[PDB]
Amino acid sequence: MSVSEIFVELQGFLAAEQDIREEIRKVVQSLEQTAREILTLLQGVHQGAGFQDIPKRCLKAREHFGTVKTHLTSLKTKFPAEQYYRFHEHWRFVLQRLVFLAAFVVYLETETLVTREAVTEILGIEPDREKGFHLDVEDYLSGVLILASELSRLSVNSVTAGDYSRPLHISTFINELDSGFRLLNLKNDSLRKRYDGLKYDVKKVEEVVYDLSIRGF
Amino acid sequence: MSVSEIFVELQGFLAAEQDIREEIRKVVQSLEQTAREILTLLQGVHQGAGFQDIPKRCLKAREHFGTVKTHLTSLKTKFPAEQYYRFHEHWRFVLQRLVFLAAFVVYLETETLVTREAVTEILGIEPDREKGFHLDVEDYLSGVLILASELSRLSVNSVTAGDYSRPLHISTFINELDSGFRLLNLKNDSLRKRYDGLKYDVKKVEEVVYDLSIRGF
Amino acid sequence: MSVSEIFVELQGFLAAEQDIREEIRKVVQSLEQTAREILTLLQGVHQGAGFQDIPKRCLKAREHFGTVKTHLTSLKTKFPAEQYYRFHEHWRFVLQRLVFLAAFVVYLETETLVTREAVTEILGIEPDREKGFHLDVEDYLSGVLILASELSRLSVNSVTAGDYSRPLHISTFINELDSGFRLLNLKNDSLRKRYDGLKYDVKKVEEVVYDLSIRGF
Amino acid sequence: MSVSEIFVELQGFLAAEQDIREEIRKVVQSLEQTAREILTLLQGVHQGAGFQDIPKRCLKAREHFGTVKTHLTSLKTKFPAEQYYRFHEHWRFVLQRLVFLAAFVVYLETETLVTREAVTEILGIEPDREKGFHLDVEDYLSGVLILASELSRLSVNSVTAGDYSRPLHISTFINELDSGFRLLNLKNDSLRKRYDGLKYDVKKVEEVVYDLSIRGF
C-alpha cells in the first residue's frame, strides 16, 4: 500500500469515528430527556403532608425506566465494546444521573442502598462480568453522592410533611455513606470534589435530628 | 485592488465598527447606573418590620424604569437593528439585570412571574414580533434565576419582619420555577451554569418553611 | 558610549533598585509580624463569652499600633517618596490588613466605620493625594471588605456568647457597607472580586438575625 | 574515562537508585493500608451517643500502631539512613496521615495536642536530634492541619450523638491551633496552602456551637 492510500484509509476511519460520536450524541440527548422526566416523577415526594404518594411515584418512575433500557440498548449498538472508555465521557453525566435516580427509587421503597449490579439490572445494562455496557465504579459512587444530597433535602421536607421518623432513618443512612467514602481511596479528581460536598449534607441532617431530639424526637 | 488598497478599506470598516461599540458602551454605562439605582430602591424591602413599604417602593421603581426606556431607545440608535447579536454581548449583563428588576417589581406586587413579553413592555422593547431590539429567552431565564436568588433571601427577611406567610408563597413559587426549568434542555453554558445555583435557593426557602412548621407557624 | 559602557551604568542603577526593594522587604516583614500580633489580640473577642473584654482588647491593640507607626516611619526612609507606586506592591498586603485591624478596633469601640483619614492617623501615616506615604482608596476598601467578613463571623460567636443584640447591629452595618459599595462603579478587578464576597456576608448575618427572631428574641 | 564508560557507570547508580524507590513504595503501600485501618477505628467513633467506646477504639488504634512501628523499621531498611530528604517525597503523604491519626488518638484520650516528640515515640522513629529517620516540623504541622478538619466532623457527629459538650471543647481547641499557626511565619511550602483551610474548619466548628447555644450554651 502507498502513502496516499494509507492516509485515505485513515481519512475513512476518522470519518466513521466522528459519525459514531454523532449517533452517540443523539442517544445521550434522548437519555437526558428521559432522566429529566423521571426526576420530575420523583421530585414530587418533597411536597405535601405525609408520604402516601410513595409507592405511586416509585411505580411511575420504574415504568419510565423502560425507555431508559431500550435507549441504552440502542446506545450499545453504536460503538465497539472495547471503545467504551473512549466515548464514555459522552454519557458520563447522564449515567451518573441514572444511578442517582435508580438509587433514589430503591431507597424510597426499601430505605437501603441499591447495589452497583442492581443498578445495572434496572438500567438494562450489563453486570461487571457479562461483556458489554458496564457501570463504572466512579459513576456509581457519584450517583450515590447525588443521592445523599437529595436525601438531606428530603429529611427537611419530611418534617414539614409531618413525618418525624424518616429524618432519623435518613440520618443514620447518610452517616454510613460518609463512613464508607472515607474508607475509600478515591483518586478521581471529580469524585473527591463531589465527596467534599457531602459534609454540607451531613450537617443539614444533624440539625434536623437535633431539632427533633430537643422536642422529644 | 492592491493588498494596500484592500486593507485601507478594511480600516475604515473596522474604525466604523469600533465607533459603534464606543457609542453602545456609553449608553450601557448609563443603563447600568439606572439599574443600580432601581435595585437600591427595591432592596429596601429587606429591612424593617412588616412590608407596608412594598407599594411605595414598587411605585418608585416603576417610575425609574422611565429612564430605562429612554436609554434603550437611544441604544437602538447606536447600531443597525440587523446586527443585534453582533453587539449583544455589550448589554447582555444589564439586560439580564433589568429582567430581574422588572420580575422583582412584578413579584412584589402580584406574587407572579412576569412574562417575557411583559418585561419587553416595561423596558420599552419590542416583542419577538416587531423587529427591533428583542429580549432573548436566554437573557430572560438568567434574569429569572437572579429573581429566585433574591426571593430566597427575601424569604429569610420576611420572617425577621414578622411575616410568616410570604415564606410559604415564595417556597411554592421557587419550586414551580424549579419544575419549569426541568422541562428545558439548556444549551447555553452561562445559563446552564447559573441554573445549577437554583437548587441552593430551593433548599434555602424549604428550610425556612421547615423552621416555621416545626414551631407551629 | 559603547554598549558595555551603557550596561555597566545600568548595572549600577539596577543594583541600587534591588537594595531598595530588599530594605523595603525587611521592614514589611516586621510590619506583617506586628499585624499578626494585633489580630491574635483582637480575635480573642470571638471566645470572650461575655464581650466585657472589648475595651481591654482594643486598648492593647492600640498599644501595638504604636509599634506599627514606628515601623512605617522606618519604611518611609527606605525609598524615594516620589515613587510610592513603584514599590507599593511590596506593602499592599499588610497595608490592607492594617486598615482592617484599625477598622475592627474602631467598630468594636464605637460600632462605626473608621474614616480613611482616621486610619491614616492610627498608622502615623500621611493623608490623601500628596504629602508622603499615603493610603490608597483601593487599599482602604479592601480593608473594609475584610472587616465585613470578620464581622459576619463575630455575629455568629456573639450569639454563642449570649449577646443577641450585636447580630442585629452588625446586620444593619454590613447592609450599609453593601449600599455604599453599590454607589461605587468599581473598575478594579481585584476589588470587584473581593466585593462579590460581601453579598455572602450580608446573607450570613441576615440569617443569624432570622434565627434569633424566629426563635423569639 | 570515555563518554561510554561514564554513562555505563551512571546507568548503574541510577538503576540502584530506582530499585530503592521500588522498595520504598512497597513499604509505603502497606503503611497506607494500616493507616486506613486505623482511620476506620477512629472515625468509626464520631457518634453513637457518647460511649466508653472512645477508650476501646483508641487502644485498638494503638495496637495497629504497633504494626506501623514495624513497617517503618522495615522502611529504614530500604535506603541509606543518610538520604532521608532525598527519598522523603515517597512517604511524605503517609507520614502526615500517621501524624494526624496519632494526634487524633491523643486528642480523643486527653483533649490535648500531641507533641511532635510523642508522635515520634508512637511511630517508633527517632527524635529530630537522634539520627536516622525523623519527623520534621513541616510534616508535623501538616498532620495537625488534617486533625482540625477531622475535628469539624467529629463535632457535628457528637451532636447527632446526643453529646452536646464535645463541640464546645473542640471549638476552643481549634481556635488555639489557629492562634498557634498565627505565631508562625510559614514562609514556606504548600503548608501555607493547607493552613488557609484551617479558617474554614474554625468557622465550621464555631457554627456547631452556635447551633447548640441557640438554647443555653
UniProtKB/Swiss-Prot annotation, chains A, B, C, D:
Region (DNA/RNA binding): 86-90
Top EC group: hydrolase
Region (Leucine-zipper): 177-198
EC number: 3.1.-.-
Family annotation (Gene3D superfamilies): Translin, domain 1 (1.20.58.190), Translin, domain 2 (1.20.58.200)
Record's subcellular location: Cytoplasm; Nucleus
GO terms under cellular component: cytoplasm; cytosol; endoplasmic reticulum; endoribonuclease complex; male germ cell nucleus; nucleoplasm; nucleus
InterPro entries with a match to the protein in the record: Translin, Translin_C, Translin_fam, Translin_N, Translin_sf
Keywords recorded for this protein, A-Z: Acetylation, Cytoplasm, DNA-binding, Endonuclease, Hydrolase, Nuclease, Nucleus, Phosphoprotein, RNA-binding
N6-acetyllysine: residues carrying this PTM: K187, K199
Keyword DNA-binding attributed: yes
Function per UniProt: DNA-binding protein that specifically recognizes consensus sequences at the breakpoint junctions in chromosomal translocations, mostly involving immunoglobulin (Ig)/T-cell receptor gene segments. Seems to recognize single-stranded DNA ends generated by staggered breaks occurring at recombination hot spots. Exhibits both single-stranded and double-stranded endoribonuclease activity. May act as an activator of RNA-induced silencing complex (RISC) by facilitating endonucleolytic cleavage of the siRNA passenger strand.
Quaternary structure and interacting proteins, as annotated: Ring-shaped heterooctamer of six TSN and two TSNAX subunits, DNA/RNA binding occurs inside the ring.
Annotated protein name in UniProt: Translin
Record organism: Homo sapiens
Higher taxonomy: Eukaryota, Metazoa, Chordata, Craniata, Vertebrata
